Structure formats: structure tokens, C-alpha cells
Amino acid sequence: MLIEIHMIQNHSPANLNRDDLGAPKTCYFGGVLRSRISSQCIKRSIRTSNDFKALAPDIALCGRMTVEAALQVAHAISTHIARPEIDYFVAADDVPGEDAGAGHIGESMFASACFYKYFSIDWEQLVKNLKGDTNLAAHTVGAFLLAAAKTNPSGKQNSFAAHNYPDGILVEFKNSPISYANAFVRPVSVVKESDLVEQSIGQLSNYVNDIRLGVIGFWFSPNNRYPLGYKHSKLASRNIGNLNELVGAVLDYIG
Amino acid sequence: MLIEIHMIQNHSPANLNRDDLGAPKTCYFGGVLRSRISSQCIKRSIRTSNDFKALLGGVRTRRLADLIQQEAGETECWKKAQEILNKCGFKNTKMLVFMSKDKIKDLARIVLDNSLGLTEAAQQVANVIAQATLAPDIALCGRMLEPNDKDKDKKVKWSNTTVEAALQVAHAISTHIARPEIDYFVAADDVPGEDAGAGHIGESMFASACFYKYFSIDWEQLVKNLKGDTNLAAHTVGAFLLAAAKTNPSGKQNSFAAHNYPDGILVEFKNSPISYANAFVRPVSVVKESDLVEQSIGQLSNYVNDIRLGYYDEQSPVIGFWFSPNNRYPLGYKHSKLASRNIGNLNELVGAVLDYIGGFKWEEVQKS
Amino acid sequence: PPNTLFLRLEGALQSWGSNEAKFALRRTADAPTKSGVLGLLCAAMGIGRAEAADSWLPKLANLRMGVRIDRPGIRWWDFHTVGAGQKTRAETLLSRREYLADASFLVALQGEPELVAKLSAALAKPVWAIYLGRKSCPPSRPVCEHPPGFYNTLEEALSAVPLQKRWHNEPLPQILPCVMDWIPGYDGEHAPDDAEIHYDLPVSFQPPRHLPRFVIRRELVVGEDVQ
DNA sequence: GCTAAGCGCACCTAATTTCCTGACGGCAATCCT
RNA sequence: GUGAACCGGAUUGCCGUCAGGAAAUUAGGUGCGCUUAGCAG
């Protein structure tokens, strides 16, 4: 069976991923230019985390020269139009001199977006390279869930402290790998009566309700801040307000 | 262990940061325009603060030759200093170099002023440049510099020079929609004439906004950058807290004397960094009752409550302190009576923070 | 009864590397390659890399292929850096990937009915994480969204399916690129000089060689055959 | 426990287009020769 | 597991600091809410 994790994370003005020219990584979707964090960036952010350090270690989770790592991650597609900005900066000389201004006087590139992150981890092959250690496989799945929830890319973070946690994570166990990027084909335009994160979650809920109406999924939001459907009908299997119980529910559903 | 400082500060009509065009810096957050104060601006304001006079021990300059020559009453050695800097890997009065002040002064005086060879003098000055990281300013802001390998002589070898920063500062974004404003000015001519017109006509730009400021000090990295002098790290943390609380960016302050102090400081201790910027994705709209600062504090408290009831680990519970001057603005004003250590004094907050890091008293640093 | 199996490949980012991409610079092709879809069905089967070499290639190489392009996505470039392994030295691989942004493709494979039925059944239950050419390109729409059916010719199959508009007033594609397999017919009938070549038929990767294939291009226009 | 109606005005005349500043600082990489 | 399996553009930075839209002005002129009544065997 397949475990699919969808996240809606809104990031403060930052420069998390960069190209050669210093511009934030960008993408095109729905006729609209969109911000992007590369999949390899998120994968490396998952690795080198002190949360896990404190079979063969460092081999089953990521291969090293096959291994055929079972965890896959899509590019972080923003829900709206990309809005790059210029950060005009100078570096002072802080000494009395004959001139003024000393730094490179550059133009840093940055943008802020609400990214849709797609993680798809298959249980079967992760068991396959774990020699049937179902308990250890569940433990590593939970560790990766915790990391992906509470880790961020280590981009230009000392000047852009963007450590925002996702406002909504949705875990489904469907048979085929379906990404909900098409939920945001229409770019999200913020209205006066709503916010960007709420509108993005509403669009995701609309896409989830559509197609199927014409499997089950666990919905997690911190303290149920953003409900995925405010009705008593059979729309979401469980509304989870805490991350640890979400990991527990995923674990005892898998095993 | 990370010292996280979240501050809610409202500023008077001012221009504390502008781009080349002179308009106040802005950013998009949540799809709406927000006023922005750059992170390096706050870093420098804390750096050149009156509270950092006892810890400003690093210099970032390109005219290092002038600094070396300044420590000589009559020993005129300036052309040689420029030549040795050029052969060290700088090319012109050079690129920016960050390292300590007293260290470079004494070491350059004892090295480059002595009658001796040149290439090994460049090697010695390069080692001094790389090894001068005993400054709390460098420990906080961090540095790196790699000289060009073309102009540098092959006889000069550089040791590791990358200093990892122990301080992360976010851009101060407004908690509400940004309203840029145009202040149209004239420049009066003192001598009367036949036209009776101003000497200059222009348009100034300013904005007033309630800013959310985020700081993050890595205690382990700050101690590592200062080696075993942990008391120095505690002093640096306390002085940084005081400077961030009491110092404002030095923008157009002569014309816009916006010297307002923050109305709420949340100092929290956790092993992972948390930014509460998403508390203000929805812009704060002022209503008849309450105010902009009160509503911002309420939204921040709501987000902190949801974060605590969300990502929570029983193994390492997160503790925190709330500061408001004389308990003017409470965090959980209506129902969240969760913080049992609300403080109404900045010095008491500094003392509590220092006590939590370790057995540190604010007067205990008066021993060296 | 069903002779043709339909595959839907749609997503924000997709990349089907063409034959002329072997340096640190890696570009992409306008349409999915036969090698990519062959790998997709191989992953759906779950057979290993070495299982193909054990007299398995011609059981799938004979599948007639046809690619339909619904919307032409513009070529988007991604700068990828590889740290590889970090005695040690600063060795960072330089790479640039090409991705098709906002593109949708329809792949039709023609073969004997039982193989198509088994292919669809295994696609409905994918044993391995399938993607759109690269692991970082997941399918935004189900691959088995269009079900297998009995259609005489590929043109009739392509014209039978209606086009669904995203909204009421959008610029529809007046030009519809298409890719179809060149039918050899009887013995002889050599391909003309105007037939393009494509190297996307894998048989072995030691040495890595892909047999060339011929691809011809056709047109389908809506509003000219249906009132 | 609950009476209604008629009636409601026009506007001339709306000032003065170059009074508007200068300067200094803007990679460091060369990621199988 | 098919140009695909291994895959971060990593760090340093206040524009700072010059400035009265001012000297002109009566909305000035017109006007009946007005006709009907026991809170009492």
C-alpha cells in the first residue's frame, strides 16, 4: 500500500532555494509563474537532522554506492502567482573615511509563497530493504513524518528566518499515486474576507470532494486551526489536532 | 538550546528602511503588501547599539591599511601595508574584511612593522586574519571571505575562515496591510526673490506599521564560537536582548523620530526554531474596540496556543516568558491563562533568561 | 475485446529526456519517449532491472505506441547541484534539467487484448512508486483515468474522447501535435527521408544502447467533423 | 378596537504648467587537468 | 525500478544623517402644516 502526504506550508519572505543568478527557484503552472522549492532541497532538509540522531544505519533510509529508496517527494508548487522582490542592500565600512558606502551594493532576490508539498512513501519496498522489520519500518516512517513536519530547507535562513510549520497535512492511503497540484490550476487570489492559507486549504478540499463524487484520509491541522470541511458528513476520516497522535494513527493503521 | 525572541513593536510614521528609489521597503506575505524592515538593518542597529559597547570587538572594513597605519605615532608604514594586503589576496581600498580590532592592531604592528621578508609576512598576516574570531559580533553575525586565487601568491596558504553564524534574524514584516504614504516637501529659500518659490521640491515616502520581529540565538553555536568562555556567551545573549528591545533602526530618525519600544516580547526556549509569522497571514484589521497592537498580540497568542496544542512533545516541553511593560498588554487576555511567568520588567526578563541558560547573574559579568 | 490501452500523463512538472542529452546538460523532449512508458509499465509489473535481459525485451517492444499532446507546455529549466559524497574535496556536480511545465499527454498502446487487460489491471494496482520520467514528477491525474476500449484506428480513438475545457473562455489549442508509430505494413516500404528518428528503445545498459525508431506526426482538429 | 391628501424653485460664476539637489562605494567561484 | 537508480547554489551586508505648498476669498438672494374630534352609565 501507498502512503501519500500532502502539506500546505506558508513561508515568510525568504530565499529558500536559489538558481545560479540568485533568483528564487521558479516554475510555470496554469498560465501563471509560480515559486518552487526543489525536491532534492526538501530531501536534503530531511537528512542531517539532529532529531533522529539523538540493519545498517544510513543505508536503508538513503542508498549509497540497487537500494531503490522508497521515499519520493515532488517539487514544492506554490498555490498562487510568484512575486519576486528586490532587496537593495549595502555593507557599511563603520570607519571615518574619504568616501561613503563599502559593500557590494547588490540586489538580493526573495519571495514568499504558500507551497503545496507532496510526499509519497511506499510501505512495501521500505519493508523490502528492512528485511521485514515492520516495527523498524513504522518507526522510520514516523521519524520521517516528524522530520518533514518540523524541518525546513537550510537556505538563506540566517537573514530570512523562515521556520514556519505547515498549517495543514493530509495523509491518504490510496492505491494510485495522485498529486493534488491540479487543485491549484486556478491561482489563488486572496479576498478581503479570507486569507491565503484558508483559501488554499479550501481549494484542496474542493478538489478532494470533486472527481470522486462526480479510500480514506487522515487530516491534520494544528489544534484544528483550519478545518477541511465544517460539516458532520462523511468527508474526512479523522480530524487530528496534534502531530504525535497523527503519527500514531498512521502507524497503527499501517501496522 | 535556542533562545527565540518574538517581539511585537508598533512604530510611528517613519522610513526606517528604503531602497534606491527612497520608498520604504515592502514585501508580499499572504498575498497582501506588508511593510518590511530588513534583517541586516536590525542586526547592525543591535551591533552599533549603546548596549554593545562592551562587546563590539570585531571590525568589518576594506581600508585595513588605514587601520594599521593609525596605530603608529611616527612609524610611517602604509605603502608596505597596502602591498602586503594586495599580496595576501586582496585587489584594489580592498574588499570587505571581517575580524577583530585589537587583535589586528597588535598583530599587524608586531608583524608588518618589523624589518623582515614579504611573502612570509603575507602568510603571517593571513593567519592572523583567519584566526581573529574572538569577537561576540563575529560570533553572532558570522563571516566568510575567500581571497581571489589569481592575485594571491602561491606561497600564501589560508586556513579555515568560515565562521558559522549563531544568530538568525528574520525580516520585520507588518502584521497588517501596508499603507505607503507620500510626504510632499519643499525647501524654503531664506533670501526673498522675484518668484517666491522653494529652493527644492520633492516627495518623501513613509509608512507606519506594527512589525513582528523574530530573533534566534543558538546557545551551543555562540559558546562554540567563543570557546570555553561561556560567561561571555551569556553576556552576549543578555546584551543582544537588551539592544533588540531598546534600539531601533537609524533610518530617517532626524525627520521621523520613531523611537517606540516593543509592546510585547516572547522569549521561548526550544531545540528547534519556530517562526510565528504565519500568525499574521490574515492582515490585522482594526475595529472600534481594542487597537492594532492588542489585536496583533491576540493573534500571536492564538497562533502560539495552536502551535503548543499542535506540535508538542512531552519529552522536552517548551517553556517561555512573556514581557509587556508593567503588564500593559497580556498575551492570553481573554482565556489563555497558561503563561505563569509573565514579566513586567525587561531587566527581570533578562535575569530570568540568564538564570534559565545557567547560573548567570547580570552583575556576574563584572569580573574581567 | 480491448486492443488499445490508454495512459494519462499529466502534472505540473514532467521531463522525458531525448536521445540528444548525454552531457552534464540534460534537455527534454516535447513528447514522452517509448523508453519512459516502457519503464513505467515495467515498474507497474515490479520486475527488476536484470529480469528484462532474460529473454523479455520482444514481449514489450512489439507494442505499437501513439502519443497525443493536448496542451504544449513551455520548456522550463531547473538548476540542480549534486554534492555526491561529503580523503574529501570540494566536488560538486554541475547539472541542468529541462522540465515541461503545464503539459498533458495521452499515450495509447496497441497490442493483443490479454496483455492490454493485464497491463491495465497492474496499472490499477501499482506495486512501485510511479512517476512522470523522474522520481520528482508525480502524476497529477490518474494514469488509468481513461479505460481500455475497442477502437479500430488510433485517429478514431483520439477523436472519440471529448476535450474538457478548464473554464468557459480559454484559448483552445488550434494546433494539436501528435505522435504515432510508423506502420511497416508488408515487407519493404522503407521510411522516407522526411521521417524523424528517435532513440528510445532499450535492450541493454551495458553497453547502454537504444535502438532507433521512426516517428511520424499527424493532425486532429475539433469542430470539423462534429457539428 | 388603529382617519385620510396636495404640495416639494430655478444657477451666471470653477485662480496662478519646468520653484524640482548633488556623490561615493557595486566580488570573493573558476565546483577531473 | 530505463538519459534513469545515488542528487541543498552553502555562507558575509543600516542609505544615515538636507528640507515651511505660501502670500486669495460673505452661499449674498424665496417662503402659514393646514385643515376634523366627550377616555365616557
CA–CA dist B175, B177 (Å, integer)? 7
SS3 C217: strand
Which residues in C11-45 are b (16+ Cβ under 10 Å) and which e?
bbbbbbbbeeeeeeebebbbbbbbbbbbbbbbbbb
CA–CA dist A42, A153 (Å, integer)? 6
Q: How many CB atoms are located within 10 Å of the residue B117 CB? A: 8
Contact B184, B49 (CB under 8 A): no
Query: Which cell goes with B254?
Result: 532626524
Residues forming beta bridges with residue B211, ordered by sequence position: B9, B174
Amino acid code (one letter) for B246: K
Query: Which cell goes with C220?
Result: 486532429
Question: How distant, in Å, are the alpha carbons of B193, B237, C19, C23, C76 from that of C30?
Answer: 73, 57, 12, 19, 12
Query: Which cell goes with C8?
Result: 494519462
Amino acid code (one letter) for B181: E
Nearest CA to B30 out of C159, C205, C75, A188 is that of A188
Query: Which cell goes with B197?
Result: 518659490
Residues present in chain A in total: 255
SS3 A187: coil
Give me the resolution in angstroms, 1 decimal. 2.8
Residue C92's nearest nucleotide, by CA–C1', is D31
Question: How distant, in Å, are the alpha carbons of B16, B23, B229, B353 from that of B251?
Answer: 4, 12, 35, 30
CA–CA dist B162, B145 (Å, integer)? 7
CA–CA dist B235, B46 (Å, integer)? 14
Residues present in chain B in total: 368
The set of residues, in sequence order, having a beta carbon less than 8 Å from that of C191 and lying 6+ positions away, is C182, C214
Query: Which cell goes with C85?
Result: 559524497
A169 at interface of B, judged by CB pairs closer than 8 A: no
Residues forming beta bridges with residue C76, ordered by sequence position: C99
Q: Name the phi and psi angles at A245, rounded to 5.
A: -70, -30
CB within 8 Å: A94 and B61: yes
DSSP states along A200-246: HHHHHHHHHHTTT----EEEE-GGGSS-S--SSSSS-SEEE-SHHHH
CA–CA dist B333, B340 (Å, integer)? 13
Question: Looking up cell 474526512, which residue turns up?
Answer: A236
Question: How distant, in Å, are the alpha carbons of A121, A212, A238, B228 from that of A172?
Answer: 11, 14, 11, 50
Q: How many CB atoms are located within 10 Å of the residue C54 CB? A: 8
Per DSSP (E only), the strands in A60-198 are 71-73, 76-78, 85-88, 107-110, 114-122, 168-172
Amino acid code (one letter) for B1: M
Residues present in chain C in total: 227
Which residues in B254-277 are b (16+ Cβ under 10 Å) and which e?
eebebeeebbbbbbbbbebbbbbb
**Region class of C63: left (phi > 0), else alpha (psi between -120 and 50), else beta:** beta
Question: How distant, in Å, are the alpha carbons of B71, B102, B105, B119, C98 from that of B109?
Answer: 7, 10, 6, 17, 56
DSSP states along A19-63: -TTSPBPEEEETTEEEEEE-HHHHHHHHSS-HHHH---TTTSSS-
Spell out which residues of chain B touch residue A150, defining contact as CB-CB under 8 Å.
272, 311
CA–CA dist A137, A126 (Å, integer)? 7
Q: Is the previous residue joined to C138 through a cis bond, with omega within 30 degrees of 0? A: no
Spell out which residues of chain A touch residue B274, defining contact as CB-CB under 8 Å.
163, 165
CA–CA dist B176, B196 (Å, integer)? 43
The set of residues, in sequence order, having a beta carbon less than 8 Å from that of C144 and lying 6+ positions away, is A176, C7, C8, C120, C123, C124
C-beta within 7 A of nucleic chain E, residues 193-212 of C:
199-200, 202, 205, 210
> 3-state SS string over chain B?
CEEEEEEEEECCCECCCECCCCCECEEEECCEEEEEECHHHHHHHHHCCHHHCCCCCEEEECCHHHHHHHCCCCCCCCHHHHHHHHHHCCCCCCCCEEEECHHHHHHHHHHCCCCCCCHHHHHHHHHHHHHCCCCHHHHHHCECCCCCCCCCCCCCCCCCCCECCCEEECCEEECCCCCCEEEEEEECCCCCCCCCCCCEEEEEEEECCEEEEEEEEEHHHHHHHCCCCHHHHHHHHHHHHHHHHHCCCCCCCCCCCCCCCCCEEEEEEECCCCCHHHHHCCCCCCCCCCCHHHHHHHHHHHHHHHHHCCCCCCCCCCEEEEECHHHCCCCCCCCCCCCCCEECCHHHHHHHHHHHHCCCCCCCCCCC
The set of residues, in sequence order, having a beta carbon less than 8 Å from that of B56 and lying 6+ positions away, is B47, B48, B135, B137
Contact C212, C201 (CB under 8 A): yes
C-beta within 7 A of nucleic chain E, residues 91-150 of A:
91-92, 94, 100-101, 103-104, 106, 108, 122, 125, 128
SS3 A129: coil
CA–CA dist C3, C115 (Å, integer)? 9
CA–CA dist A92, A105 (Å, integer)? 10
Question: How distant, in Å, are the alpha carbons of A15, B166, B213, B243, B324 from that of B248?
Answer: 25, 21, 12, 9, 18
By the 10 Å C-beta count (0-12 exposed, 13-18 middle, 19+ buried), C108 is classed as buried
Helix axes B119-131 and B102-111, enclosed angle (nearest 10): 160
Q: How many CB atoms are located within 10 Å of the residue B159 CB? A: 9
Question: What chains are in contact with C, requiring at least 3 Cβ pairs below 8 Å?
Answer: A
Structure solved via: cryo-EM
A109 at interface of C, judged by CB pairs closer than 8 A: no
Query: Which cell goes with B279?
Result: 500568525
Q: Which of A12, A104, A194 to mutate to test the interface with B (most CBs of B within 10 A)?
A: A12
CA distance B308 to chain A (A): 8
Maximum Cα interatomic distance, chain B, rounded to a whole number of Å: 81
Question: How distant, in Å, are the alpha carbons of A237, B90, C5 from that of A75?
Answer: 27, 41, 29
Chain D bases near protein Cβ (<7 Å): 19-21, 23-32
Question: Looking up cell 563584572, which residue turns up?
Answer: B366
Nearest CA to C134 out of C100, C177, C94 is that of C100
The set of residues, in sequence order, having a beta carbon less than 8 Å from that of B295 and lying 6+ positions away, is B284, B285, B286, B287
CA–CA dist A9, B49 (Å, integer)? 36
C66: part of which helix (H) or strand (E)? strand C64-71
Question: How distant, in Å, are the alpha carbons of A86, B13, B103, B312 from that of B115?
Answer: 50, 58, 20, 65
CA–CA dist B172, B26 (Å, integer)? 10
Residue B147 Cβ < 7 Å to strand D? yes
Q: How many CB atoms are located within 10 Å of the residue A86 CB? A: 13
SS3 C8: strand
